Design a protein around this ligand. Structure first.
Ligand SMILES: [Mg+2]
Ligand SMILES: [Mg+2]
Ligand SMILES: [Mg+2]
Ligand SMILES: [Mg+2]
Ligand SMILES: [Mg+2]
Ligand SMILES: [Zn+2]
Lengths: 71, 129, 24, 102, 135, 221, 220, 83, 83
RNA sequence: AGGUUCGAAGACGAUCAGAUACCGUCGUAGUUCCGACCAUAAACGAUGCCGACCGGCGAUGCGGCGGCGUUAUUCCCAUGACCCGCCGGGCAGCUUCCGGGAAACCAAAGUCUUUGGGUUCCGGGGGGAGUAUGGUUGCAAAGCUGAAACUUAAAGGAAUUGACGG
């Protein structure tokens, strides 16, 4: 079970903030490596220069050439 | 080891009530237990209870009237102020028409209605409905 | 694979990696 | 799913039980897990008892018995049909099969 | 092989036996001659098969109480059940062999000291219960 | 029955001891322990005949509390008691069920065998667990003739007498019939009942098939 | 054109029992659906919650049967839920209607506080359980309505409950379990004991003994 | 029930088991309500009036129904004290 | 049995119960007067004595300690102290 | 130190389409003992410890207590071996609509939306991955601590029907 003493608040909060690192949303939002790996750098939109026009094959059940641009 | 005598007694009463026994024996007695049982008896949820007195901590035999649903305990005796007594009340009670919360106050061990009547807070003890 | 044999394969690969790094 | 409450063996309050070798394939089986058969067979065939009695130099000669304790892993037990698979309800009984005296 | 009768013939045979037990007999031809007027059988083969089963069941009935209802068998059973109360009861024994413990029970009940009770010597050894396990 | 008229008589004691009905089994049910006097050196439990009488009188009151005598049903699956339940039903106007009890009798309302009584009288709980279980679907109170090892799961007026002895079963059924008839306006409580308790006794076929011819020889000679 | 085979059904038919509460008092099982329409005629509103196509794999492919969940009840304190699986959807619907009629329970309405007029909410917080679905009904003040998922919302509405908080846990996507748990929670409102019911119960005659003389004459 | 105005706002009042004091539910078909017929003092004949005991399904499924009925009959006077 | 009287248990079960699990704790041991043959004085001996009790007027042993109760030497008499 | 047997590696004979295997013959290290390391197992009850309560039954092990009797010697009790019980602590078993649970099942995995006896460890979809790197321990093998990028819409558990089974 969990501790329930009147002066267990330190252990409760320490365990909570230790266990909060084990879900993906908190880890992504508070580690910063996801922010570094994000090409937009935490921005909603971005601007770029079209390097090329490419076609991407769809997944296994579908069959199409999705039109994309390398930017 | 046994660290909450009141919790053990209340769990024993609840289990005997669920099983349908007519009498329950709670082995470690205390003043807190006697006051809690007196509150429950004055509100009519239990019958008479008799204290077997040995030179150690006594025992109590309670006559169960069959009109008890739950008599749980709040083991960490939180400080209850009159401003948060309502939140405790609607967290622990089945409804606002019945059910009582026993809390130990400076004026004594008594239910939340009397605590609000004489305008005092205290430490939470348990509840019964 | 069997998990035990994946473990063995990984151990072999780790020894090879340690040897390569120690060589440097 | 847990198939058997006793986990297919008699080990209840023990940590380790010494192994034995299967009489058929020499597999190491825990002693409490192996199927044990205590065969007590006439040392001569029931067809040849009369011939041995006739050829005996004695009159009231009691033919000796042969006492062998056999241990089986469950694989050899099932292959040799000493034990058989049973239904989910029928697995729970432990009464040995009847001797069929008559 | 392959002479098992079906419900169509068995039920019909039982019904006509319980209806016309007086007219039926142990002769197959006599039974197959009563069948045409005691029942409507669409087929001659069905009729004679039913008649054969009727002969079999009547042989079984005359040798014993087959489950098929029969008024003579039922009145005999009635006489054998609701009568033959013996002229002397089976519960009016002159003496009753009574255990001392039961005698104490009767004494506590206040029915002790009865002239029709003879106290047995209690057994010694306490050797009840079957030996546990095999062997 | 707490009254002086509602007391066991010496004749009743004599019949009870002659038929047995106090020699229980070697096993004891924890809910049947309260009816036991003492355990013999035989391992046989002795049942308090006074408690048995009180439970029998309570069962008689429960039976006579029903206005329609057909609303009470009597069941004995075992052969040692089918004659008893038939004679009990004949005497008291009850509805008998003997031998095989088809499941769904009290619950499946389609077949013509469907019936719904107001009281369930059972010869033996172990032998008649099926009507006992079916009684819990239709709000059916139950009297059962229980032994020292008889389960009391769905039993309400358990009578602690016997269920193994044919003589005991016949005697207890005859006693219950006599009690309900005397509670009703049938027998005047004074003279002994004219029905011999042997009329309720189950007889084995090797007695049915020889006693009548023995009596025939004794009559012709 | 209704010919009952039941003592209770006969008594209902021949104007011997006046209220469904008389049956509810003695907990007599309702074994035929033509009993309760005689009482709640033209007031039993009906609704179909879901049609689900269960399947059973066989040698020649899998066959499909349709399961119907049907909730009925007048908006005054009676509600019932019936589940019936049948080959045809219409047959399943009719069977589910019959089963919902059979399984009609009364609903106890209480007050959140300051009892003024007609009761509007559950008398206390009640928990229904079915599978992994746990449904808790909490009393609510006047005018809040039913706050809940739609599937328990319609059931609580046709049960006559005006205001109620709901809290559900588990796989509530399982509509059958999620409706059955709420039905259990509604049904145990009387099973819950409250101090206003502490009075010692006076016992009245059961219908079976009250009309035993008429039953002998009519229901042979 | 029994709002401030005083009237009983409740369509029916369920029975309570005479042993465990538990509410007998509407769909609890295991429950029973039997009648025990008491007799007159002098002749032991049924006098018409009786007394009723109700037992809930939980009690008469756990098996304490016989003990419950016996205790109630003892308390009410049906069973003699020297039982 | 839902209605066992816990307040007033009869002495039979009161004695069969464990010493600590009784309603009030009661030791199973006692004190006894012991008479050694050939001696006049009376020795007070614990029933569960752990030591070899000896007479001061005679070089004789009165009891031998065992697992549960001191086994008195043969020829010695004994009586209880006040039940 | 010792090395009988068995037997990783290895050799050979078979089998096979191939057969670095399953089968057979031989056989090194090991398996044995003493001393020093390692600290891992489906190290399992896949189930933390302490405490209380909540059904029944028959057994079993130890200790104690009380009883008809049988048995051992002896002249009687003790003391052993049985028989019948009671108590306490254990290994368990059968049964049950106590109750729980997704169910299998569990008298604990119960006394949980009627949620609080005390306390420790620990999980957060599947992979990547128990991987990389850093630290630390070790003679080594390795042990402990332990990511991220990226990828994915399921992966899983229990049960039901069918199909299939050398
Ligand atoms: Mg498997
Ligand atoms: Mg191990
Ligand atoms: Mg070799
Ligand atoms: Mg803790
Ligand atoms: Mg993960
Ligand atoms: Zn083998």
């Amino acid at each position: 079970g969990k501790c329930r003493g009147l002066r267990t608040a330190r252990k409760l909060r320490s365990h909570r903030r230790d266990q909060k690192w084990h879900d993906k949303q908190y880890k992504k939002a508070h580690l910063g490596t996801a922010l570094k790996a994000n090409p937009f750098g935490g921005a909603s939109h971005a601007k770029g220069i079209v390097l090329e026009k490419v076609g991407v094959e769809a997944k296994q059940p579908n069959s199409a050439i999705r039109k994309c641009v390398r930017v | 080891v046994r660290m909450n005598v009141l919790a053990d007694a209340l769990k024993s009463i609840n289990n005997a009530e669920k099983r349908g026994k007519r009498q329950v024996l709670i082995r470690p007695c205390s003043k807190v237990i006697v006051r809690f049982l007196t509150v429950m008896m004055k509100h009519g949820y239990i019958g008479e209870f008799e204290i077997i007195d040995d030179h150690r901590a006594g025992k109590i035999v309670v006559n169960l009237t069959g009109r008890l649903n739950k008599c749980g305990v709040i083991s960490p005796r939180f400080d209850v102020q009159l401003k948060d007594l309502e939140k405790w009340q609607n967290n622990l009670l089945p409804s606002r028409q019945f059910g009582f919360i026993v809390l130990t106050t400076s004026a004594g061990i008594m239910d939340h209605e009397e605590a609000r009547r004489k305008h005092t807070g205290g430490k939470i003890l348990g509840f019964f409905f | 694979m069997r998990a035990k044999w994946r473990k063995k394969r990984m151990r072999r690969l780790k020894r090879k990696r340690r040897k390569m790094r120690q060589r440097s | 799913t847990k198939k058997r409450r006793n986990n297919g063996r008699a080990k209840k309050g023990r940590g380790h039980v010494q192994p034995i070798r299967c009489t058929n394939c020499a597999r190491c089986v825990p002693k409490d897990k192996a199927i044990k058969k205590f065969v007590i067979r006439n040392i001569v065939e029931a067809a040849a008892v009369r011939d041995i009695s006739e050829a005996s130099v004695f009159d009231a000669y009691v033919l000796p018995k042969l006492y062998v304790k056999l241990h089986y892993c469950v694989s050899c037990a099932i292959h040799s049909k000493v034990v058989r698979n049973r239904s989910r309800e029928a697995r729970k009984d432990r009464t040995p099969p009847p001797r069929f005296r008559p | 092989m392959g002479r098992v009768r079906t419900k169509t013939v068995k039920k019909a045979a039982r019904v006509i036996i319980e209806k016309y037990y007086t007219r039926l007999g142990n002769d197959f031809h006599t039974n197959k001659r009563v069948c045409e007027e005691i029942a409507i059988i669409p087929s001659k083969k069905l009729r004679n098969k039913i008649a054969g089963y009727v002969t079999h069941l009547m042989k079984r009935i005359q040798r014993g109480p087959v489950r098929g209802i029969s008024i003579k068998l039922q009145e005999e059973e009635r006489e054998r059940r609701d009568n033959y109360v013996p002229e002397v009861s089976a519960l009016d024994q002159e003496i009753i062999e009574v255990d001392p413990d039961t005698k104490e029970m009767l004494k506590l009940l206040d029915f002790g000291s009865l002239s029709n009770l003879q106290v047995t010597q209690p057994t010694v050894g306490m050797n009840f219960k079957t030996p546990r396990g095999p062997v | 029955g707490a009254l002086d008229v509602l007391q066991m008589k010496e004749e009743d004691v004599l019949k009870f001891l002659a038929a047995g009905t106090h020699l229980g089994g070697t096993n004891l049910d924890f809910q049947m322990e309260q009816y036991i006097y003492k355990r013999k050196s035989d391992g046989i439990y002795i049942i308090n005949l006074k408690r048995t009488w009180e439970k029998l009188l309570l069962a008689a009151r429960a039976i006579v509390a029903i206005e329609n005598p057909a609303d009470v049903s009597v069941i004995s699956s075992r052969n040692t008691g089918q004659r008893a339940v038939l004679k009990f039903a004949a005497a008291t106007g009850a509805t008998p069920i003997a031998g095989r009890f088809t499941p769904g009798t009290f619950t499946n309302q389609i077949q013509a065998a469907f019936r719904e009584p107001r009281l369930l009288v059972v010869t033996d709980p172990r032998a008649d667990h099926q009507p006992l279980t079916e009684a819990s679907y239709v709000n059916l109170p139950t009297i059962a003739l229980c032994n020292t090892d008889s389960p009391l799961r769905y039993v309400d007026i358990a009578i602690p007498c016997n269920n193994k002895g044919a003589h005991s079963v016949g005697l207890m059924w005859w006693m219950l019939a006599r009690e309900v008839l005397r509670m009703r306006g049938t027998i005047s409580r004074e003279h002994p009942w004219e029905v011999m308790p042997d009329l309720y006794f189950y007889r084995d076929p090797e007695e049915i098939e020889k006693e009548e011819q023995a009596a025939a020889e004794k009559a012709v000679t | 054109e209704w010919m009952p085979v039941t003592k209770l059904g006969r008594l209902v038919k021949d104007m011997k029992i006046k209220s469904l509460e008389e049956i509810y008092l003695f907990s007599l099982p309702i074994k035929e659906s033509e009993i309760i329409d005689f009482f709640l005629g033209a007031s039993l509103k009906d609704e179909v919650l879901k049609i689900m196509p269960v399947q059973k794999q066989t040698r020649a492919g899998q066959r499909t049967r349709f399961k119907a969940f049907v909730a009925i009840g007048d908006y005054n304190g009676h509600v019932g839920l019936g589940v019936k699986c049948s080959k045809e959807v219409a047959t399943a619907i009719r069977g589910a209607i019959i089963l919902a009629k059979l399984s009609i329970v009364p609903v106890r309405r209480g007050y959140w506080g300051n009892k003024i007029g007609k009761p509007h909410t559950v008398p206390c917080k009640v928990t229904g359980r079915c599978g992994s679905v746990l449904v808790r009904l909490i009393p609510a003040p006047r005018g809040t309505g039913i706050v809940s998922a739609p599937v328990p919302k319609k059931l609580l509405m046709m049960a006559g409950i005006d205001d109620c908080y709901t809290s559900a846990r588990g796989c509530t996507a399982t509509l059958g379990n999620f409706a059955k748990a709420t039905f259990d929670a509604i049904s145990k409102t009387y099973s819950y004991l409250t101090p206003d019911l502490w009075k010692e119960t006076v016992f009245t005659k059961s219908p079976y003994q009250e009309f035993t003389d008429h039953l002998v004459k009519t229901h042979t | 029930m029994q709002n401030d105005a005083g009237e009983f706002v409740d369509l029916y009042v369920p029975r309570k088991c005479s042993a465990s004091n538990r509410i007998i539910g509407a769909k609890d078909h295991a429950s029973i309500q039997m009648n025990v017929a008491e007799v007159d003092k002098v002749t032991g004949r049924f006098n018409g009036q009786f007394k009723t005991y109700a037992i809930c399904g939980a009690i008469r499924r756990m098996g304490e129904s016989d003990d419950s009925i016996l205790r109630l009959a003892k308390a009410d006077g049906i069973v003699s004290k020297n039982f | 049995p839902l209605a066992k009287d816990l307040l007033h248990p009869s002495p039979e079960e009161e004695k069969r119960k464990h010493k600590k699990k009784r309603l009030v704790q009661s030791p199973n041991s006692y004190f006894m007067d012991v008479k050694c043959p050939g001696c006049y004085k009376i020795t007070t001996v614990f029933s569960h004595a752990q030591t070899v009790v000896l007479c001061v007027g005679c070089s004789t042993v009165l009891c031998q300690p065992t697992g549960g109760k001191a086994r008195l030497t043969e020829g010695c008499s004994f009586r209880r102290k006040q039940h």
